[PDB]
Design an enzyme around this catalytic site. Sequence first.
Site, PDB file in Angstrom:
ATOM      1  N   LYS A 174      31.147  35.937  -8.598  1.00 13.54           N
ATOM      2  CA  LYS A 174      30.955  35.688  -7.226  1.00 13.54           C
ATOM      3  C   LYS A 174      31.478  36.679  -6.265  1.00 13.54           C
ATOM      4  CE  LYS A 174      32.927  32.213  -5.075  1.00 13.54           C
ATOM      5  NZ  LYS A 174      33.441  30.707  -4.511  1.00 13.54           N
ATOM      6  N   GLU A 191      39.600  28.967   4.120  1.00 11.88           N
ATOM      7  CA  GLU A 191      40.000  29.960   3.450  1.00 11.88           C
ATOM      8  C   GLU A 191      41.178  29.837   2.631  1.00 11.88           C
ATOM      9  OE1 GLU A 191      39.649  32.116   1.209  1.00 11.88           O
ATOM     10  OE2 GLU A 191      38.704  33.794   2.086  1.00 11.88           O
ATOM     11  N   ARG A 192      41.749  30.041   1.324  1.00 14.48           N
ATOM     12  CA  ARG A 192      43.100  30.176   1.016  1.00 14.48           C
ATOM     13  C   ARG A 192      43.673  31.530   1.210  1.00 14.48           C
ATOM     14  NH1 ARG A 192      40.126  28.497  -3.891  1.00 14.48           N
ATOM     15  NH2 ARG A 192      39.946  26.066  -3.728  1.00 14.48           N
TER      16      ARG A 192
HETATM   17  N1  LIG Z   1      28.986  42.944 -12.277  1.00 14.37           N
HETATM   18  C1  LIG Z   1      30.276  43.084 -13.074  1.00 14.37           C
HETATM   19  N2  LIG Z   1      30.246  43.999 -13.679  1.00 14.37           N
HETATM   20  C2  LIG Z   1      31.281  43.828 -14.662  1.00 14.37           C
HETATM   21  N3  LIG Z   1      32.398  43.087 -14.701  1.00 14.37           N
HETATM   22  C3  LIG Z   1      32.258  42.182 -13.835  1.00 14.37           C
HETATM   23  C4  LIG Z   1      31.143  41.869 -12.872  1.00 14.37           C
HETATM   24  N4  LIG Z   1      31.052  40.993 -12.320  1.00 14.37           N
HETATM   25  C5  LIG Z   1      32.185  40.376 -12.536  1.00 14.37           C
HETATM   26  N5  LIG Z   1      33.051  41.218 -13.812  1.00 14.37           N
HETATM   27  C6  LIG Z   1      34.207  40.656 -14.300  1.00 14.37           C
HETATM   28  O1  LIG Z   1      34.447  39.245 -13.971  1.00 14.37           O
HETATM   29  C7  LIG Z   1      35.891  39.288 -13.103  1.00 14.37           C
HETATM   30  C8  LIG Z   1      35.913  38.206 -12.127  1.00 14.37           C
HETATM   31  O2  LIG Z   1      34.687  38.546 -11.257  1.00 14.37           O
HETATM   32  P1  LIG Z   1      34.818  38.032  -9.666  1.00 14.37           P
HETATM   33  O3  LIG Z   1      33.852  38.548  -8.766  1.00 14.37           O
HETATM   34  O4  LIG Z   1      36.203  38.289  -8.871  1.00 14.37           O
HETATM   35  O5  LIG Z   1      34.788  36.551  -9.758  1.00 14.37           O
HETATM   36  P2  LIG Z   1      35.654  35.530  -8.892  1.00 14.37           P
HETATM   37  O6  LIG Z   1      35.518  35.785  -7.603  1.00 14.37           O
HETATM   38  O7  LIG Z   1      35.063  33.948  -9.070  1.00 14.37           O
HETATM   39  O8  LIG Z   1      36.954  35.441  -9.385  1.00 14.37           O
HETATM   40  C9  LIG Z   1      35.998  40.913 -12.502  1.00 14.37           C
HETATM   41  O9  LIG Z   1      37.278  41.199 -12.365  1.00 14.37           O
HETATM   42  C10 LIG Z   1      35.446  41.505 -13.925  1.00 14.37           C
HETATM   43  O10 LIG Z   1      36.379  41.424 -14.963  1.00 14.37           O
END
Ligand SMILES: Nc1ncnc2c1ncn2[C@@H]1O[C@H](COP(=O)(O)OP(=O)(O)O)[C@@H](O)[C@H]1O
Lengths: 73, 57, 456, 456, 456
Positions: free
Chosen positions: E153, E179-180
């Site tokens: 996300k 927001e947290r």
């Molecule tokens: N586009 C991407 N390319 C590569 N890895 C990704 C990508 N999107 C998510 N990930 C992997 O998933 C993890 C969590 O994504 P994140 O955007 O932070 O989700 P959330 O905010 O719900 O925690 C990232 O740290 C990475 O390891």
Amino acid sequence: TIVVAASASESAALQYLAPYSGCTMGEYFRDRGEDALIVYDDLSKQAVAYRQISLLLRRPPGREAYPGDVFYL
Amino acid sequence: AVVENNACEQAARMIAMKNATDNAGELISDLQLIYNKARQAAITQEISEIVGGAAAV
Amino acid sequence: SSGRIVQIIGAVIDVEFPRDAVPSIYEALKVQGVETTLEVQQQLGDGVVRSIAMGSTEGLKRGLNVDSTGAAISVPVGKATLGRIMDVLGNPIDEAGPIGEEERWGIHREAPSYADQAGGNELLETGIKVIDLVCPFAKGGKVGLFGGAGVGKTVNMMELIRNIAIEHSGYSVFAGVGERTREGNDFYHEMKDSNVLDKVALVYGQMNEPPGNRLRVALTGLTMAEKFRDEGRDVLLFIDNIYRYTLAGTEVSALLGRMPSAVGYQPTLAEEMGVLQERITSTKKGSITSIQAVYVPADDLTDPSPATTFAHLDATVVLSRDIASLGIYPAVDPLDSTSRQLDPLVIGQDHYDTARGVQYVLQRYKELKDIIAILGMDELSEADKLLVARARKIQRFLSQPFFVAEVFTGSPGKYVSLKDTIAGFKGILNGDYDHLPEQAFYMVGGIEEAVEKAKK
Amino acid sequence: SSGRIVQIIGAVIDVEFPRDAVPSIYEALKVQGVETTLEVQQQLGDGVVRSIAMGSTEGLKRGLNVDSTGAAISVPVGKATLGRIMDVLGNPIDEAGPIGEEERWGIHREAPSYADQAGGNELLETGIKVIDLVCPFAKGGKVGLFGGAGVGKTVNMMELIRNIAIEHSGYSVFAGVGERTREGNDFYHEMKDSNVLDKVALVYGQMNEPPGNRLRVALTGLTMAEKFRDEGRDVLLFIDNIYRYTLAGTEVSALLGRMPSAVGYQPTLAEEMGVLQERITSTKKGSITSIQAVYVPADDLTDPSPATTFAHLDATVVLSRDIASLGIYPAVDPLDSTSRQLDPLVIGQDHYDTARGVQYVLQRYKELKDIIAILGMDELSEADKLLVARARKIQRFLSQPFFVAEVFTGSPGKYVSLKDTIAGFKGILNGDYDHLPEQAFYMVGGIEEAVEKAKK
Amino acid sequence: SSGRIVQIIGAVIDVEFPRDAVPSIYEALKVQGVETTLEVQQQLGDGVVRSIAMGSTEGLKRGLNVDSTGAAISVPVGKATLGRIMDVLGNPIDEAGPIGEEERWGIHREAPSYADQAGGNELLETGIKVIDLVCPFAKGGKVGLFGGAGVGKTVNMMELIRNIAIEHSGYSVFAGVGERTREGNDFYHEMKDSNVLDKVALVYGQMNEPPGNRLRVALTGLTMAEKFRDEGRDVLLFIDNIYRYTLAGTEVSALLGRMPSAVGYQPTLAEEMGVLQERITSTKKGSITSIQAVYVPADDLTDPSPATTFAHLDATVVLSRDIASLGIYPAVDPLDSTSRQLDPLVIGQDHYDTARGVQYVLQRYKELKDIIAILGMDELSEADKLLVARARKIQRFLSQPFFVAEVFTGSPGKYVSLKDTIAGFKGILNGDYDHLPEQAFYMVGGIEEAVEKAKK
Ligand SMILES: Nc1ncnc2c1ncn2[C@@H]1O[C@H](COP(=O)(O)OP(=O)(O)O)[C@@H](O)[C@H]1O
Ligand SMILES: Nc1ncnc2c1ncn2[C@@H]1O[C@H](COP(=O)(O)OP(=O)(O)O)[C@@H](O)[C@H]1O
Ligand SMILES: Nc1ncnc2c1ncn2[C@@H]1O[C@H](COP(=O)(O)OP(=O)(O)O)[C@@H](O)[C@H]1O
Ligand SMILES: [Mg+2]
Ligand SMILES: [Mg+2]
């Protein structure tokens, strides 16, 4: 048999009091060393008559708009 | 003939159990809607009773 | 000074006193002429106090003079209360004349301090298979008989009283709160005919009495038990239904000017319960062992009243309507009942393993029941078919004929010892009785009587 | 004397009168500048009365003068009402001029006493197989057609009006309480073209009307019927929807200052129904056979209004949306529908056994529904499969094309006698028709037509 | 002029003003000597106003002086808000000094009029293949984002923030509704490290703030977005959780004493949602497009909050935990995700047929995968095995390396055009790339890059 009637068109006060009036007529035999049997054809209708009076007297409602003392009734 | 009919029994049963699994899901789907309706109705009734008692006391 | 009744509404009465003579919270008041007592619950202001009648109000009028007693309800305590039947005000409700009291205590009191609590794990044997196995009681512990309407709360309590109170060397208090007047008469004649009435104090507040009576009967019985505990004695306290105390507060709460909370309960449900429950305890002077019957509205254990009660007890025994509907008594749920004593360090590893073994088989049978209903029993594995047979035997070996239930069954009562219970369940789990039919285990006693029953 | 409008809130109006001239409860009042009629509901004190307007309140203001009439709303009664349409106040609404009334009666009366009651056990053949089988009607009794929105209540009433006017020779009274204005126009022209109109009195207060009209129209119809009953005549009192009398009461209840009861209903719900329902009876002087449609909110039969109505009726016909979804009409539930006339001493053993047998068969089929739903019919026992087959035939044989539905369908209507009804169901129960396909029983009237339908 | 505090009840404060100086509804008031802001909610009359504190009320007392500001809560707007963190009142919560503002706007205004609406539907080219093909966004539209944590996300929001600024000359605003504080600090550093912080304005209403702050933060962020739209830009408004905006409204409505609605929500539920959502539209100057995360209570899509929100959504993007395991990092579910713009009368026949072609092939492959698992790959027809091969190529071609994900993917980012997206999928559906290995279609961007990645 003694038949005590408080029909659907009668005042909610008479429907609320009818079980107690019939009970009093049955108690006459009990207190004099005799046996009696009493049937209350609908205590749920007596509770609905008591709920009406209580709401019109503006007493605060309970679990299904029923008076707080419906158990004690 | 007997052996081939046993192979037919197994295949027929595979289909019967797939159908039964699908039918179960449909019933679960219908019951969940009735459950959500009951959940929402329980909340509205309680609030009316709380508001009703507070409007007297 | 003197007060005048200003407002009567049901069981609640307002009394107006001089603004320099306003009686204290929980203070007892007496109406002039009429024989009625009122306890101050709230000080509304301007010399007026809100009180609840400890009797009927059919004879009360506006303007009747009320007298301040300067204290809360004072009931008689000590040795003079043994072998007597009393009301909420402590008056004798038996024809044996007056009670020779040498002291009166106030029903309202503080709970023992955190430094006064005492810890003990002495195992108390009951003689019932299901309880001795999954709900082992402790001396000085708090027991609760949870259940709906018509599942065995009174019957089970009477059996315990018989298997414990009769042998108990110390004294005992029995409090009938919101009970049927017929049960109170049967129990009084039972204690009197059994010659045990000499060591039991009886306090009765039945369903025909005003809300205020049913709201303080529990404090009267507990005040008598506290006098005995504080003398250094070991006491037994039996309460017929502690729910009637909560309900009396719900019946009067709205007339006291309090807004309702969830499920139409008083907003003070958890504090009113904590104030009573914290006094029923075993301190460092003496030990109160207590058994309370807890009514469950509409059989729903999630209802605020039952749900708030579990945290106050050491042993929780749960009675199930679905088991009673199969003609199985005691109707104890072995998967919802629990005790602080069900621990390997306290009861031993053999008993603990046998109890957990029985619970594992019953939980697995609960999930196989639906499979057997739709598809049938032949579509199960060989291990599952064997487990279902043993689960049905364990479920019937938990039934027991009771001495207090012979009028209901016609069959003689039985007392099983803890050694016999463990042996009988360990044997069924092991497979030592996989030939006997499930009907041989229904209403028997020890495992030998199942072996004899099977032949016939 | 004359009062002043002091308050206006929707359909409810407060009027102040001199302390020596306050109108009594139910007295009718007229506003001077608009001639709008008001009915007094209660006396509030200080010479102030609260009333409901029998018309629209738009354009009314505080300070307008109000005249007390000295009597309740009075309507014309007798022969002059036959073949005429009237409103809640007894005014003609058919453009045919003034009513040739000889006398008027107030719309509020006490129900006849216990010693003026009459017992009617004479069966009234309807011509409808399901009703003649499980819901037998009686002359001088009360019938209720319970049902949700669009399930068949008005269609089943129009068919009963058609097949009961075959044997009945007296007068009829029809009260339209809160229903469609188009349906009142359709019924008036149908009877006018059929020359049936000169024996029917028509009263209307439809969905377009304010709350006061919808609340009192039921009383106006019943009052005219009471005039005919007390002349020693046999009358038919038809009510378009009795639930609308209760609902009009709910819209006004909070405005009358009353605290609400369960699900927002007025606290007076059961009394308002009984006060109207008790007057609809067969006395010793005359008889009032009454048929009432009863709307069921959101298809919930446990709702306070439908739940309170069942006790006021001799025959209960419960329509179902599920039966209607399968194609069956009339959509009556044989397991939920019942009658006081379904007794061996009233209808004979043969009819009673046929009805008991039909119900027994359908009840078992309802219990096997879930098993067939997941596993199909092929896993049932040999006997179960046979019942499921007879239950399916009985269900389609309860279907019947009506003469008031040939416009919707195009198929011709059927009238089935009680003798043919009993013979058809007895044959299906015995197995005399186990060789016909299920679709040979759907909309076939008599059993012989099922035999001729099976030839295709 | 100035008023005085008259009553303090939690977060609700009543203030008395002179009859000639009563502040308007929604006007902001300042307490003298304390950093506390009050928003006026209602004018009780007699000079007294009811307001909600925008901060803690600890330490406040009756009689304190309060000053009217003449307008609603006014926040800084324009270029100076980029790369900054602000509270509900527009104060810089980051320790980076005062905001270099040139203008301030009030947070309350009417939605753009009927005449201000744009002349058609214009797609917003995100540059992301799966979104531009299966979930086409309209300019001025609202997108619902569904899924759990750890599914991409945050990375997806940062890529959209980068692309609107670099490829369309736009800007972004992020509204942290409830927001947290831990996640708010982590997101600020992740955007600084990913070099997107200077392209977005951050407005946070933290969970520990009073209900009034959490309710108004969405209007503060929306006011900053409105300014950029007037500049002549296309803007992205990210709302951290739209369910928390609804709950903050429920909390405020309960504090003000309003009567609750169905399922306990505020009576103003649909109006409060409409006031926020109707400002997000495509005008004749610019267009605010919004991405909103959606939470569903008790998994019930019929609950008032989900029901009301879905009425204002133009597209639904679902992120799948299963797809992520496969290795497609975007993780958007092509079968569950939907858009109202997926209509041939809006996007033309070519885009529509290509998108529906991809969805048909991916549906068939999900069914065939269960067959291959239960029965085996040898059981399938030659045509079905050819489909499985194209479906796998399509599934991998839905992947794309993002410029903010170079740290995770170890490869440079790609921005695919809608034209290149349609051409690539149309070719794979027709079979123009059936000779290439599926891996050649993984993390490549446009279709020409798959050709070369296969050449090596
Ligand atoms: N586009 C991407 N390319 C590569 N890895 C990704 C990508 N999107 C998510 N990930 C992997 O998933 C993890 C969590 O994504 P994140 O955007 O932070 O989700 P959330 O905010 O719900 O925690 C990232 O740290 C990475 O390891
Ligand atoms: N142990 C038992 N053996 C036989 N019947 C029992 C037993 N316990 C309960 N019952 C049945 O139920 C009744 C006892 O219910 P009771 O103990 O009064 O329940 P509760 O106090 O929970 O309302 C008996 O009259 C009997 O019919
Ligand atoms: N063949 C049918 N027989 C009976 N009812 C039918 C039939 N087909 C449909 N219904 C519907 O039932 C409606 C009348 O019943 P209902 O709606 O319950 O009465 P009401 O008008 O009083 O609300 C008809 O207008 C008709 O559309
Ligand atoms: Mg009991
Ligand atoms: Mg109708």
